[PDB]
Design a protein around this ligand. Structure first.
Ligand SMILES: Nc1nc2c(ncn2[C@@H]2O[C@H](COP(=O)(O)OP(=O)(O)OP(O)(O)=S)[C@@H](O)[C@H]2O)c(=O)[nH]1
Ligand SMILES: Nc1nc2c(ncn2[C@@H]2O[C@H](COP(=O)(O)OP(=O)(O)OP(O)(O)=S)[C@@H](O)[C@H]2O)c(=O)[nH]1
Ligand SMILES: Nc1nc2c(ncn2[C@@H]2O[C@H](COP(=O)(O)OP(=O)(O)OP(O)(O)=S)[C@@H](O)[C@H]2O)c(=O)[nH]1
Ligand SMILES: Nc1nc2c(ncn2[C@@H]2O[C@H](COP(=O)(O)OP(=O)(O)OP(O)(O)=S)[C@@H](O)[C@H]2O)c(=O)[nH]1
Ligand SMILES: Nc1nc2c(ncn2[C@@H]2O[C@H](COP(=O)(O)OP(=O)(O)OP(O)(O)=S)[C@@H](O)[C@H]2O)c(=O)[nH]1
Ligand SMILES: Nc1nc2c(ncn2[C@@H]2O[C@H](COP(=O)(O)OP(=O)(O)OP(O)(O)=S)[C@@H](O)[C@H]2O)c(=O)[nH]1
Ligand SMILES: Nc1nc2c(ncn2[C@@H]2O[C@H](COP(=O)(O)OP(=O)(O)OP(O)(O)=S)[C@@H](O)[C@H]2O)c(=O)[nH]1
Ligand SMILES: [Mg+2]
Ligand SMILES: [Mg+2]
Ligand SMILES: [Mg+2]
Ligand SMILES: [Mg+2]
Ligand SMILES: [Mg+2]
Ligand SMILES: [Mg+2]
Ligand SMILES: [Mg+2]
Lengths: 163, 163, 163, 163, 163, 163, 163
């Protein structure tokens, strides 16, 4: 009936694009997210309330204001960006150790799969150290926010962890 | 008057096909079940509420959310898949030891009997270690969800364990 | 209704893997255990509270903090490691002489039996000097945490020493 | 109205099979009993609560946890096993000298009489030294747990020693 | 209701084995007894408190610490060891002259009768000079601690000298 | 639930950087610590209260004000600084002899491992004379406060010595 | 329940190593013992309070401060040091004639048996003139403090002389 979500990731990942592809159905032009966007999207008789936030180094320290009462998390990672996959691992291993996100479900959108140099979801699952997760449910999906592929299959998995 | 059921199994078994052969009467095209499907089907003045779930390795850890208040279980096994009959045995022996499913009735749909290389229900009864069950009623039926054979004979047995 | 357990052993044995094979049902990737993990697992209407600890030489001196109020002990030994079976014997004969573990039940998981060079449970029973135990109940089981074999047969024996 | 029973014996005797032939009415497949099974069976307006335990050499030392508040004992002996009739005599003469079982009624199921090489109940009565019993009521019955013969004639005798 | 016992003898006799055959019922592996073992065993509504001690030449001089308040003595002699039957005679004739053991009852376990070269209890009664005992009750029993024969017939005789 | 920590070391080690890498997650610019910094960081349901202090020769004489009620100590040593490893040994051997830190747990952050000329944790363990510690638990971890490596593995070990 | 011990010997013997192998279980690095170390170790429900002292020629004259109220003595001798076995004999024959140690039990740890040139316990028993002891109980054990062999067999003998 209701669910709260927090979309996060590094800069350039695709968070805003994913959100406004789910909410509107169209690919909008984007500006860097200094503040935050919040939007409700309905699916399977469930109303997800997604909070997209900034990924710039200066806003990554303000994510803590949103950890509270968060039932799911969506970590978006740019697959073409193979040089920052270590920074994302640091961020995610730091945010998995926070106690406010202790029960949160973990979903990972490996975005930008339409690009030729994109890296597979298994290569990302290995590079991010996702099998090391033990206190938490987790899942990884390959997406293309510009085409909508894999986006409605993530909200479908998040439904498993309802209530 | 009412009854709750949980259809489970490995990936590729036939759970969704069975459910929407009971509910609609037609063989639908299928996509992998990331989330869950739920459907009510009426038979013998009884309204079974079936919950079909995913069998992918990543969703097999989310079945626990559904064990509660479950009055029957339907384990679907692909008979042609003779290489994964051990994995199904592991899953079933693990899920028989859970205390939330302590009184649940056990039914086993040995599906895909229309295939030439299919294995008999007795060979499956031996490979799955079903005679080892002692705290539980159990039953095994040979099916073909594409043709509907053996599907209405399972709901008929589940009626024995009403109320 | 309740029971407290302490899983211990040398480094590389399989303690964390055993624990999160009992708790989750899946084989997780692992990191060396510097601190401690604690998890409750239900079985036979009993809630075992298992404490997995480190086996590095530097943490073997901190196990004493956990001996108190411990009702069972699970000593995991790597069978393939035939060169450190003497060190494990030293550790176990030292920890059997402690007075806080005076009534504790002893279980021994001879793990890594899936490996070809693994050594039998009787060869381990001879090398560890287990028949020399006289003030204590004891038992040895052959396991494979990656496949779950022999793991639910140890918790079954620990139930004998309930209350 | 109530009665407590302890089924014991060597390994391979037929304890679990007897119990789940009385409780369910069917011959189940069996696994070695590492822990314990407990089941209530009604007969003649009496509710016997039977505790079946392991017979492996390692569990024979844990039977003492169950001697307390035990009103009847059922010693199952394999008749075909004519090479271990001395070990059973040792076990039974040891367990007859315990003070917690001081008033317990003694029943002996000489099982596996369907086998051609089976030994008579009188030959067993002589080999077990049962006439030497003087502080205790005792009785010996010839059974076949696979067919149920002689099983309901033992619970019938145990009723003599009610309250 | 209570009774205190002192098990003594030469090295290799069978004292520890006898004690932990009475207490546990199983034949344990053994290490030389440098210190002492103490165990309570119940039988015939009597709680014998047995003190097993070392027989090495260096510990035979520390037995005096235990003579006090000792109500019975159990001298174990290896029958196969026909070359040290004179040393045992010396030890026993020395310990019969002590004034702290002035009223103690004397029992002699001629152990290791299962061995082919074992010597009869009468040959031992002659070699040990047991008929020369006049200030003391005495008794000699033939045993086999590995099989338990003759062990419960010694505690039975010790009951004669209760209180 | 709570724990008090004292981070100390020579000047240039990395204490402030470690503290504000644990607390904020970012690498801050730093000024020499004339006074003291104090910060609470949560991890594993434990709230460590860390006190970072100055290492200048003039402030090393004011550390005594903080020894009281200190449950853990974190000695940070610059590995690249191979010319002051003797001064750190002097400081640590002096502060190990204080009676207010009598029960304190010892952790050693060998920091600046990202530098090419850095010295191994074993070379530091030898140069600091850490095996000479006998009245105290101790542990040494290799870190890189700029990257966060090895920092959450020290707080994990400090949890072993809780309460 | 309690016992007081004095560990003594020449320099280089192994006293400190023995003590902190009994107390901690690990082999610590060592410095010459100018003063004294004191540690309580529990075993067999007994709390031994061991006082390790220096063996340098200048501290051998301060041992007298500790002779009082000493219930046991542990003389450690280096077996590899075959050139100072006469000096140890002098020291021990001098300290056996003191009247404060008149009732003390004597134990001798012939340490460093892991070395190839080590001398047997009987050769030491002959060289030290231990059979000449007549006013005192005595015992000699072969050890290896680095491996713990023979250390828990000395505390076991010291228990014989309790109270
Ligand atoms: N070619 C391609 N571009 C994508 C895809 N997904 C997202 N993008 C594009 O990549 C750019 C960055 O996406 P954007 O949503 O603006 O970043 P962000 O996640 O919000 O992070 P920020 O707000 O801190 S800059 C955008 O131009 C967006 O259109 C994809 O699948 N393929
Ligand atoms: N030939 C044949 N195909 C069958 C039969 N029963 C089911 N199937 C087919 O096998 C395929 C898998 O069935 P499906 O229901 O989609 O898997 P699932 O049980 O839902 O598991 P999943 O959702 O995690 S992929 C489908 O193409 C389905 O049509 C059968 O009896 N014969
Ligand atoms: N091939 C095989 N590997 C096993 C088995 N059991 C455990 N392991 C593997 O051996 C490795 C060590 O297991 P692990 O649980 O991490 O050690 P530990 O007991 O926790 O000790 P540590 O934390 O101090 S490193 C792991 O890679 C684990 O997956 C087995 O039965 N077969
Ligand atoms: N042929 C035959 N088999 C019997 C009979 N009674 C029991 N059994 C069989 O003998 C085997 C052993 O019986 P079982 O009940 O499993 O041993 P147990 O008494 O429980 O002892 P355990 O659990 O320590 S292995 C089983 O395969 C069982 O089916 C009988 O009367 N005839
Ligand atoms: N073959 C055989 N061995 C026996 C018998 N009784 C005892 N033993 C064996 O003889 C050996 C010595 O017995 P043990 O109990 O250890 O000596 P002890 O009396 O305690 O004397 P010690 O502790 O000073 S070495 C053991 O290996 C034991 O198992 C017997 O009846 N037959
Ligand atoms: N290259 C590198 N620099 C590090 C590392 N860890 C800490 N530092 C850097 O070394 C410098 C000293 O660290 P700092 O935390 O300010 O010293 P301090 O421990 O607080 O001691 P002080 O306050 O008395 S000056 C800083 O510029 C810091 O950024 C590292 O791992 N690699
Ligand atoms: N190779 C070997 N070394 C041993 C053994 N036992 C003790 N030592 C070593 O011999 C050295 C001396 O031991 P130590 O305990 O320091 O002397 P001490 O008895 O305390 O006398 P001191 O304090 O007046 S210098 C140490 O380096 C110690 O590690 C052994 O069994 N084998
Ligand atoms: Mg954005
Ligand atoms: Mg499906
Ligand atoms: Mg581990
Ligand atoms: Mg059984
Ligand atoms: Mg002995
Ligand atoms: Mg600073
Ligand atoms: Mg010393």
């Amino acid at each position: 009936k209701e669910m709260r979500i927090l979309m996060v990731g590094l800069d350039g990942a695709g968070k805003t694009t994913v959100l406004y592809k789910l909410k509107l159905g169209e690919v909008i032009t984007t500006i860097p997210t200094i503040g935050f966007n919040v939007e409700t999207v309905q699916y399977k008789n469930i109303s997800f309330t997604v909070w997209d936030v900034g990924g710039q180094d200066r806003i990554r320290s303000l994510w803590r204001h949103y950890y509270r009462n968060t039932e799911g998390v969506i970590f978006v990672v740019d697959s073409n960006d193979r040089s920052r996959i270590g920074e994302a691992r640091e961020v995610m291993q730091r945010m998995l150790n926070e106690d406010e996100l202790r029960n949160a479900a973990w979903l990972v959108f490996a975005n930008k799969q339409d690009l030729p140099e994109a890296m597979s979801a298994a290569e990302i699952t290995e590079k991010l150290g996702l099998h090391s997760i033990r206190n938490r449910p987790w899942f990884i999906q390959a997406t293309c926010a510009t085409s909508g592929e894999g986006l409605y299959e993530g909200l479908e998995w998040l439904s498993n962890s309802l209530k």
